[PDB]
Amino acid sequence: TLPAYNSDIQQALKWLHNQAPGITGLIQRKAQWYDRFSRQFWANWERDVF
Amino acid sequence: TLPAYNSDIQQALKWLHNQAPGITGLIQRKAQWYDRFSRQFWANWERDVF
Amino acid sequence: MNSFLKSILNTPTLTIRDDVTKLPVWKSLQVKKVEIYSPASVVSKPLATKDQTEAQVYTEALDIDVKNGKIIQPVRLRINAICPDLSTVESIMNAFNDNTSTFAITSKSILADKMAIMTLDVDQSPDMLNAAEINMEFEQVEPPVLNEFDPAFPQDSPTYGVQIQSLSDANLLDLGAIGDSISSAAKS
Amino acid sequence: STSTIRTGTNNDILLDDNGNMVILRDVEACAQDVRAAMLMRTGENIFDVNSGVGYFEYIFSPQKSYDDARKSIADAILSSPDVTGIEQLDIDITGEVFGVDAKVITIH
Amino acid sequence: STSTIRTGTNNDILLDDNGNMVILRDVEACAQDVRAAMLMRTGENIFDVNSGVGYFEYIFSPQKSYDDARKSIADAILSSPDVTGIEQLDIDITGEVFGVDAKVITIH
Amino acid sequence: QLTTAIQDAQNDSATKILY
Amino acid sequence: QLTTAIQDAQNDSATKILY
Amino acid sequence: ARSSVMRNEARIANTINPNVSFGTFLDAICALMGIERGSDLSTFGYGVQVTG
Amino acid sequence: MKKIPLTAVPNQAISFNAGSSYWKIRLYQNMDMMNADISRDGVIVCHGVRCFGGIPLLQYSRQYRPDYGNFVFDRDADWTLFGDGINLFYLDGAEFAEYQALATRK
Amino acid sequence: MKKIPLTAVPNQAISFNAGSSYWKIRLYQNMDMMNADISRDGVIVCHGVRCFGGIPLLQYSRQYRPDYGNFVFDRDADWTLFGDGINLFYLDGAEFAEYQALATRK
Amino acid sequence: KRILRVTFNMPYGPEVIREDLDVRVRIMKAALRIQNRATMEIFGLTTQLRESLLSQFTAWKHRQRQVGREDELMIKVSVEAGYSDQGREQVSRVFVGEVAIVDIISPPPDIGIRIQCYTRQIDRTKTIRNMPPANTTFVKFVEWGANEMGLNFICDTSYNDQVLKNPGRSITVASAILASIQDMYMPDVAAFVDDDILIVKDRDKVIRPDEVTNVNSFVGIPSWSEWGVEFQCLFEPSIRVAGGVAVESLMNPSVNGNYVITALEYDLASRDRPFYIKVMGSPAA
Amino acid sequence: KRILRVTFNMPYGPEVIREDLDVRVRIMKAALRIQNRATMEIFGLTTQLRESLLSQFTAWKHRQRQVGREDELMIKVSVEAGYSDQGREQVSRVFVGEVAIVDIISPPPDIGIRIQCYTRQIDRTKTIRNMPPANTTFVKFVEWGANEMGLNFICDTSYNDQVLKNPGRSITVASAILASIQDMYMPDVAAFVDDDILIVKDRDKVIRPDEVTNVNSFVGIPSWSEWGVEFQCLFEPSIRVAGGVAVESLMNPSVNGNYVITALEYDLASRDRPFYIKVMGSPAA
Amino acid sequence: MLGIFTSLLSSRSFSIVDQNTNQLVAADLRISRVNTRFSSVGQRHMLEDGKTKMDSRTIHPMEIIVEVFCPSIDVVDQINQLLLDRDTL
Amino acid sequence: MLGIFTSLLSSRSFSIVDQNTNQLVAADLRISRVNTRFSSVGQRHMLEDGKTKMDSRTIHPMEIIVEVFCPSIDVVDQINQLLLDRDTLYKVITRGMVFERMMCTSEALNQTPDMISATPARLTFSQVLVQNPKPIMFRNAGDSSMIDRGLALAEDVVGSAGDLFDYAVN
Amino acid sequence: ANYNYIVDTGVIVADTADVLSDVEAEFRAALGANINLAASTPQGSLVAAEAI
Amino acid sequence: ANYNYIVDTGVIVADTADVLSDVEAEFRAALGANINLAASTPQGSLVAAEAI
């Protein structure tokens, strides 16, 4: 409604994984895919609906 | 299933019967006969089954 | 005897905080004695034992029975202290009179939390003309169970079911649906 | 019987020679879990929030008494599975080092 | 979550530059409300009667103790919403000045 | 308390006395 | 005891035949 | 004893049913149709070049 | 026209007997909006109904005749102002038909 | 298709009302396998049944007939992994007939 | 902070007795023909409050006088209980019924009344205004009974489409309707009245399947019983009579499962330890 | 050194609960129709034992299911109490019956159950298999009832050779047989079931005249009653109901005489003071 | 205790003021000790797992115990009618 | 007391050995006094003539009260963990006197100006009564006695027989 | 696992406690029956990522 | 890893699935370049679950 919603996928990345390759790499690539296949998909699909 | 099955017959024979000729003799003779008439018998019977 | 040269990790400074505001309450409350009693309750009747079973299959059964047969009673504190100011006494009295009051007493190294005042004794005697002795007692309202919980967020909060029973009709400047429609069309 | 993916000092997933994932079990797993749980700043779990160590509320700040830091470290250690308790927790302080030492008494 | 119309030291409604009424909320509103409640003589609210500071029966009178005055001032301060308690109520007397200082611990 | 149960084993009396 | 007497009273009113 | 035999006989009681037999007994039963359990050997590479 | 008590929490479920029916609305904060799951007499009527001011909740005629009623928000749903500021009102068949007649000519 | 609750103990007996019958299975470690004694409605159906993964317990027709069901182990029985990893499932007449029809062409 | 209110209904209005006064309410409800009971001991009554309440509570004016045609004959009182912390309330309703008995248990200096109320104590109703059906089905007889009593009904049973020749023309007053609905078909399907809702259902079925109450924290231990599981709990304003429960115990792992409720024992004391509800539950089908 | 055993009968076998566990058995028996009762408070139960006992004790599988044709429908439990010193035993039998009620009295840390067993709780019988006699004598109707119930009978009365027309054709179950035998001819000759023996005798006559029990030590004082002599005693494993007693008191010299037993109140607690039996006796003829 | 001035070397410490008529009573007691003990009771509730929820708190009435010396029979009678005075606080 | 010639100049008096894992617990407490009080109850029954039969005797659980000084915060935390430990039974060895199956009933810390560095404490343990003090066990994992689970009310799963077959095939 | 949050009466969305528990149980069944899914561990980080 | 768009004949967005190769290619080159992604291993199970 009002008090924010974050939902950033990368929120699951603690201070421990500051210089890690792996965990950070996996989470970044997973976030990129979920972005491309949800946010980009819905953006261009709303452009379709328009 | 997994955690062994004991069944040695000679498990009865404490450290006390270390120099005993008799209790040890009886247990060894009985173990030999149970072996000969059960384990050897069933091994030969499976050789028959084959 | 320099009492300001306190230890570093075992500081003998009593700090009664407030779980609501997380601020130290009742400073300048020179404390003379603190007693922390933590009871429990064990089985009284003889437990049954099912023997003629194996090694270690009896062990977890006994462990569960023992985990099942002792009930913990939470902690009580008894602070004996000397109040020098009327403001502290009035604050203590008001907090006691308040039904809802949870504090976090931190003794030398004890960090007991969710603590509520039970009794309060104020003794005024001819040998302490200024200041007065205070004997206050505390009981743990709730053991510090770790709320794993679904945090950080308005959303993701678990659904709690408020089962309403009887519905009130209405109020304000409303005439049924035309009043509702005017209120909605007001865009406010 | 705790089990954990084996990680290196960089807290990253470190594979074996054949490129597999090692699943440490029991003692080594518990040690790794305690080390990882002590390196987690408070308010980092969007699924616990209240969990973690107070590295900015009780440590790294002009705190009067470090008993709160001791309690936070003890809670962080105890939160790990199969820990039971702590035998010793030292809070020694050098000139600018907050030296802490633990003696966890994990069951296995 | 207290809210009050902003008033000046002359204690009327004081408007802003735009000609509006400011609605102070929380801390400033509670401070203004406490100051107003400490300036109200007892028996002035015809709907409460007993409320208000005893400025003539407990202060300003050739009295023996001022503990009744302390109680009246404490009650007046606490009567305001979102006050909880008083951290300190210093009461000092000069030759004539009946100095009173409060340390209200409003939650918001 | 058996008194409450006694007071409960009296409610079976409607307006009908029938009589 | 009230409870034991109540349970005994309930017992003797349970046979298979509903009616 | 008197328990080893009890477990042995319960172990080999219904061993001629192939849906419930085990081990060498099942091997015997299935050898009639020609289904033969193999042997567990290992790769046996020869002539690997060694440079030194 | 019956006002339904609300509680200023993000996610909640309210079940009540109104209009000779057993309604249950689960109101939850979904991202930047609010949605409601409506179930009447155990059988669920609708899922994920986005909540707006004045706009009917049960939007489809099959969900509200014969004179089953409807639920209306005075303002756009916001759980922060629930109870004090934003109220949900239940209309029986006649009042909801009159509301439809008024709102369809605007 | 009902899993039976099991305990990680070597030798145990569990009785339950499943499939309109009063079953009771006693599972015990015999040498290096698991054996099971099955008793339905008091009478004892079988003794010393070897427990194998996928192979039904009540092997012969005279027992699981008619539509009484059967019991299947997902893996080879092992009381150490009972409750976590190895489960025993109960099938009624139709489910066990479909299991037989599938399992006879394997 | 427990919050318990006893709200009467008298000509002046509702006079809510709050939790500041010493109040002790023992409510016992069940899925039977019997009227559910509430015994409430209220101390700290002033003289004026005593005269305003006890004088209105009486068994006269309907025996040696007339003064009666509708309600206001006896005072209807509801009970609203729950918890309150951080400013949010949880006051649900736990009883609605009319007083029947007045007494004092504790003499001075604490003049504390003890009053006894039963649900649907308006049994001296209009001696059955509308005649019962001649030949009808069970559901329709239940609907007639609910309409006569004025209460909304929940009829969920497998015996609804069973015709009865002649269903209950020996009934004398409105209360006996519930006894009759209970009398016919009484191995399982027992009808009762919870608050203002008349529930007629099988004993092994839940009124609202979607309204199961997952229970994880108990007082004592959730133990077995003859029928199902019996357990005590702290007051949760979401547990009704005949509702669904999803017991998930720790001390007793075998009692886990889904249960329907048969009996409820509220014991709420604002100024005393007992604030529990005891639940009798049976397996749910 | 009291020795008290509660022996159940379960599909696995008998699990004897010994006197080491805290047990408390209150048995009350009488020369009436009503089934003699035994309340059993047993603490110190383990989780496994609770699972093995309470889950089997249930009132289902004969109401919402079928699972019943003979015994094993409900568990039959016997009680063997007595004394033991120098190695000898005195364990008699004091109660045989099936459990009917099961609750919990003491919550943690001592999870203690309280069951309620009744003699001949197998009224879940076969609804009278063999038809009662049409015209027959009293002793013959008694024999038929005993054969139907499966118990051996002791019939000793002067009313045996009296014919009855339709003696119990309205009987609905086996338990009602004893009710009918008690209903006919009830001024003196009251029939009952003591353990496994169905006794039909006059109230002023002893079942086994050669088995008089001379009683010289009492707890308290053997006092009068409006019927006979009433007295409490320490547990003697030779006093049954309907038996003959030869009270020889010291404190009260007028109560000396021969009495028959009408009631019996066993109160046996291994880990508590009460280990008494109370006897109601009437003058014996 | 501190918190208030007097700047007045004649302040009397103890006072029993009748609520109605707002008058002093027993104005000649020689107080020797005052002990104002509060009280409240908890609602300990063990629950299943080893744990005990305290629930809420009830505030029992305050009690004051005063040791005094009565120097005169008039003061003694004043205390007697204080005890026997059932209609004023 | 006498009974045992240790012939060792470093013998330890007090030990709280955790019965499982056989480990020393709170190996630093400075004990000051131990009272191991037993208890039992008689069943006095007056009977007719002036006399009273005791009947039998019940062996109530033993209790131990230990006064200690805790010099370290980790020791205080260990003692709190003992009090909060509901799943392990300890064995207390005071002076050649061994008591197994001991669980902490109560504990009282005391912080006074008489002891600024250390904290006195008063532990109290009670013994857990068991039916059989000497249990009988078996070595090899084949030969238990059988424990019955009673009625279970088999729960519900939804997989059909196809998934079960595929599981067995794999 | 995920049930069917689409269904026919609109999208039925569950709370994050439920979806987090579902992902936790799925990870537990896949990786190991007794793997610690603590938020500080790599597996717990993966679980939290798949929960967001 | 593609959304087929039937432009005018089927009017429906069709999933392509076959994301197992893509998820394997992410576990590789981010968590390593030589991981044995074969099943019956923890990483293989993780990849299969993620692809599902």
**What are I26's two structure tokens?**
């689960």
In whole angstroms, give the CA distance from residue I31 to residue J6. Answer: 43
The 10 Å Cβ neighbour count of residue K248 is 15
Q: Does N150 touch chain K (CB under 8 A)?
A: yes
Q: Are strands L197-201 and L152-156 parallel, antiparallel or unpaired?
A: parallel
Residue H4 in 3-state DSSP?
helix
| 3-class SS letters over H5-26 | HHHHHHHCCCCCCCCCCCHHHH
Q: Which amino acid, residue I4?
A: I
Sign of CA dihedral J61, J65, J67, J70: negative
On the CB side of L237, CA atoms within 13 Å amount to 16
User: N45-82 burial, b for 16+ CB within 10 Å, e for fewer?
Assistant: bebbeeeeeebbebebbbbbebebbbebbbbbbbbbbb
Please name which of O30, O23, O31, O32 lies closest in space to residue O50, comparing C-alpha atoms: O23
In whole angstroms, give the CA distance from residue K259 to residue K285. Answer: 9
The 10 Å Cβ neighbour count of residue K1 is 12
In whole angstroms, give the CA distance from residue D5 to residue O35. Answer: 9
Residue F8's φ and ψ, nearest 5 degrees, are: -80, -35
List Cβ neighbours of K256 (8 Å cut-off, separation of 6 or more). Answer: K247, K248, K249
Residue M88 parent element (H or E):
none
Q: Does A8 touch chain I (CB under 8 A)?
A: no
Could you tell me which residues are beta bridge partners of residue L234?
L276
Q: Are strands C132-140 and C76-83 parallel, antiparallel or unpaired?
A: antiparallel
Q: DSSP of K30-68, one letter per residue?
A: ESSSSPPEEEEEE----HHHHHHHTTT--S-SSSSS---
Q: Does A50 touch chain I (CB under 8 A)?
A: no
In whole angstroms, give the CA distance from residue K9 to residue K96. Answer: 11
In whole angstroms, give the CA distance from residue P20 to residue L63. Answer: 55
Look at M48 and K219 and tell me if their CB atoms are within 8 Å: yes
Residue K92's φ and ψ, nearest 5 degrees, are: -95, 180
CA distance L120 to chain J (A): 22
Q: Which residues, numbered 76 to 105 in chain J, qualify as contacts with chain B under a Cβ-Cβ cut-off of 8 Å? A: 77-80
CA distances from C8 to C11, D27, N73, N117, O45 (A): 6, 32, 12, 12, 36
In whole angstroms, give the CA distance from residue L186 to residue L165. Answer: 17
Sign of CA dihedral K65, K67, K73, K74: negative
Contact between M1 and C89 under an 8 Å Cβ cutoff? The reply is yes
Cis check: omega of the bond before C12, within 30 degrees of 0: no
User: Any idea how long chain C is?
Assistant: 188
CA distance L43 to chain G (A): 18
Contact between K247 and K256 under an 8 Å Cβ cutoff? The reply is yes
Residue J94 in 3-state DSSP?
helix
Chain A residues closer than 8 Å to I78 by CB: 1-2
Sign of CA dihedral O13, O16, O19, O23: positive
Contact between K266 and K94 under an 8 Å Cβ cutoff? The reply is yes
Q: Which residues, numbered 1 to 19 in chain G, qualify as contacts with chain L under a Cβ-Cβ cut-off of 8 Å? A: 4, 7-8, 11-12, 14-17
Cis check: omega of the bond before I66, within 30 degrees of 0: yes
On the CB side of K204, CA atoms within 13 Å amount to 12
In whole angstroms, give the CA distance from residue K174 to residue K164. Answer: 20
The DSSP code for L145 is H
Please name which of C158, G18, C90, L211 lies closest in space to residue E87, comparing C-alpha atoms: C90
**What are M34's two structure tokens?**
């005052």
Contact between E99 and E93 under an 8 Å Cβ cutoff? The reply is yes
Please name which of L107, L167, L94 lies closest in space to residue L133, comparing C-alpha atoms: L167
In whole angstroms, give the CA distance from residue C47 to residue C66. Answer: 9
Q: Are strands N30-37 and N40-42 parallel, antiparallel or unpaired?
A: unpaired
On the CB side of K243, CA atoms within 13 Å amount to 20
Contact between M54 and C141 under an 8 Å Cβ cutoff? The reply is yes
Sign of CA dihedral N135, N138, N143, N149: positive
Resolution in A: 3.3
The DSSP code for C3 is T
In whole angstroms, give the CA distance from residue L279 to residue N82. Answer: 52
Q: Say which residue the tokens 């030194």 belong to.
A: H52
Contact between K88 and K43 under an 8 Å Cβ cutoff? The reply is no
Distance of CA L170 to the CA centre of its chain: 26
Which other chains touch chain H, taking contact as 3+ CB pairs less than 8 Å apart?
Answer: B, J
Q: Say which residue the tokens 């029991």 belong to.
A: D26
Nearest CB partner across the interface for L67, out of J13, J17, J24? J17
Q: How far apart are the first and last CA of chain D?
A: 8
Could you tell me which residues are beta bridge partners of residue C106?
C15
**What are J83's two structure tokens?**
């409750």
In whole angstroms, give the CA distance from residue I106 to residue I101. Answer: 9
On the CB side of L125, CA atoms within 13 Å amount to 18
Look at M38 and C85 and tell me if their CB atoms are within 8 Å: no
In whole angstroms, give the CA distance from residue N149 to residue J5. Answer: 9
**Longest alpha-carbon distance in chain L:** 61
Contact between L5 and L79 under an 8 Å Cβ cutoff? The reply is yes
CA distances from B44 to B30, B37, B39, B40 (A): 20, 10, 9, 6
Gyration radius from chain L CA atoms: 20
Residue C103 in 3-state DSSP?
strand
Residues L167, L172, L175: CA angle, nearest 5 degrees: 85
Chain M residues closer than 8 Å to L107 by CB: 46
* Nearest chain M alpha carbon to C71: M50
In whole angstroms, give the CA distance from residue A4 to residue A27. Answer: 22
Please name which of N14, N108, N12, N119 lies closest in space to residue N75, comparing C-alpha atoms: N119
Sign of CA dihedral E17, E20, E26, E28: positive
Please name which of E76, C32, C129, C126 lies closest in space to residue M2, comparing C-alpha atoms: C129
In whole angstroms, give the CA distance from residue K22 to residue K269. Answer: 8
Contact between C77 and C115 under an 8 Å Cβ cutoff? The reply is yes
Q: DSSP of chain G, one letter per residue?
A: -HHHHHHHHHHTT--S---
Torsion on CA atoms K136, K138, K141, K145, rounded to nearest 10: 180
Distance of CA J19 to the CA centre of its chain: 13
In whole angstroms, give the CA distance from residue C121 to residue C138. Answer: 12
Q: Which amino acid, residue L158?
A: S
**What are G16's two structure tokens?**
């298979």
- Using CB atoms within 10 Å of the CB of residue C39, give its burial: 0 to 12 exposed, 13 to 18 middle, 19+ buried: middle
Cis check: omega of the bond before L108, within 30 degrees of 0: no
Alpha helices for chain M (secondary structure H): 73-84
In whole angstroms, give the CA distance from residue H12 to residue H28. Answer: 14
E strand intervals along M13-57: 17-18, 23-24, 30-41, 45-46, 52-53
Contact between L190 and L175 under an 8 Å Cβ cutoff? The reply is no
Residue K96 parent element (H or E):
strand K92-106
Could you tell me which residues are beta bridge partners of residue N34?
N66
Look at K275 and M55 and tell me if their CB atoms are within 8 Å: yes
In whole angstroms, give the CA distance from residue I33 to residue I35. Answer: 7
In whole angstroms, give the CA distance from residue C172 to residue E30. Answer: 29
Alpha helices for L82-126 (secondary structure H): none
**What are G10's two structure tokens?**
């309930």
E strand intervals along L9-52: 16-17, 23-30, 37-42
In whole angstroms, give the CA distance from residue K66 to residue K64. Answer: 7
Contact between K195 and K96 under an 8 Å Cβ cutoff? The reply is yes
Q: Say which residue the tokens 């809670």 belong to.
A: D75
Contact between N127 and C47 under an 8 Å Cβ cutoff? The reply is no
**Longest alpha-carbon distance in chain H:** 64
Q: Say which residue the tokens 């003499």 belong to.
A: K107
List Cβ neighbours of F15 (8 Å cut-off, separation of 6 or more). Answer: K62, K123, K124, K127, K173
Residue E85 parent element (H or E):
none
**What are A24's two structure tokens?**
């950070």
In whole angstroms, give the CA distance from residue K256 to residue M21. Answer: 67
Residue A3's φ and ψ, nearest 5 degrees, are: -80, 60
Q: How far apart are the first and last CA of chain E?
A: 7
Could you tell me which residues are beta bridge partners of residue K219?
K232
The 10 Å Cβ neighbour count of residue I54 is 19
**What are L247's two structure tokens?**
């009270």
Look at O10 and I11 and tell me if their CB atoms are within 8 Å: no
In whole angstroms, give the CA distance from residue I28 to residue I5. Answer: 15
In whole angstroms, give the CA distance from residue C152 to residue D50. Answer: 9
Q: Which amino acid, residue K139?
A: V
User: B21-30 burial, b for 16+ CB within 10 Å, e for fewer?
Assistant: eeeeeebeee
Sign of CA dihedral K114, K118, K120, K124: negative
In whole angstroms, give the CA distance from residue I77 to residue I35. Answer: 9
Which other chains touch chain L, taking contact as 3+ CB pairs less than 8 Å apart?
Answer: C, G, J, K, M, N
Q: Say which residue the tokens 């990786």 belong to.
A: O31
Q: Does D85 touch chain N (CB under 8 A)?
A: yes
List Cβ neighbours of K156 (8 Å cut-off, separation of 6 or more). Answer: K200, K201, K202, K205, K207
List Cβ neighbours of M64 (8 Å cut-off, separation of 6 or more). Answer: M34, M35, M36, M37
In whole angstroms, give the CA distance from residue J99 to residue J82. Answer: 23
Nearest CB partner across the interface for J77, out of B1, B5, B7? B1
Contact between A15 and D40 under an 8 Å Cβ cutoff? The reply is yes
Contact between J1 and N161 under an 8 Å Cβ cutoff? The reply is yes
- Using CB atoms within 10 Å of the CB of residue D82, give its burial: 0 to 12 exposed, 13 to 18 middle, 19+ buried: middle
Contact between K256 and K5 under an 8 Å Cβ cutoff? The reply is no
Inter-helix orientation angle H23-30/B40-49, to 10°: 20
User: M8-32 burial, b for 16+ CB within 10 Å, e for fewer?
Assistant: eeeeeeeeeeeeeeeeebbeebebe
Q: Which amino acid, residue K221?
A: I
CA distances from J94 to J57, J70, J89 (A): 17, 11, 14
Q: Say which residue the tokens 């499932």 belong to.
A: J89
Please name which of D82, D65, D30, D72 lies closest in space to residue D51, comparing C-alpha atoms: D72
User: Any idea how long chain L is?
Assistant: 285
Q: Does N153 touch chain K (CB under 8 A)?
A: yes
Residue J98 parent element (H or E):
helix J93-103
Distance of CA J27 to the CA centre of its chain: 9
Cis check: omega of the bond before P42, within 30 degrees of 0: no
In whole angstroms, give the CA distance from residue N146 to residue J35. Answer: 13
List Cβ neighbours of J101 (8 Å cut-off, separation of 6 or more). Answer: none
In whole angstroms, give the CA distance from residue N113 to residue N121. Answer: 15
Q: Say which residue the tokens 């004043």 belong to.
A: M78
In whole angstroms, give the CA distance from residue C129 to residue C127. Answer: 6
**Longest alpha-carbon distance in chain P:** 45
Q: Are strands L76-85 and L152-156 parallel, antiparallel or unpaired?
A: unpaired
Sign of CA dihedral E29, E34, E38, E43: positive
Contact between J88 and J4 under an 8 Å Cβ cutoff? The reply is yes
- Using CB atoms within 10 Å of the CB of residue K91, give its burial: 0 to 12 exposed, 13 to 18 middle, 19+ buried: middle
Residue E6's φ and ψ, nearest 5 degrees, are: -70, 130
User: Left if phi > 0, otherwise alpha if psi is -120 to 50, otherwise beta: which for B9?
Assistant: left
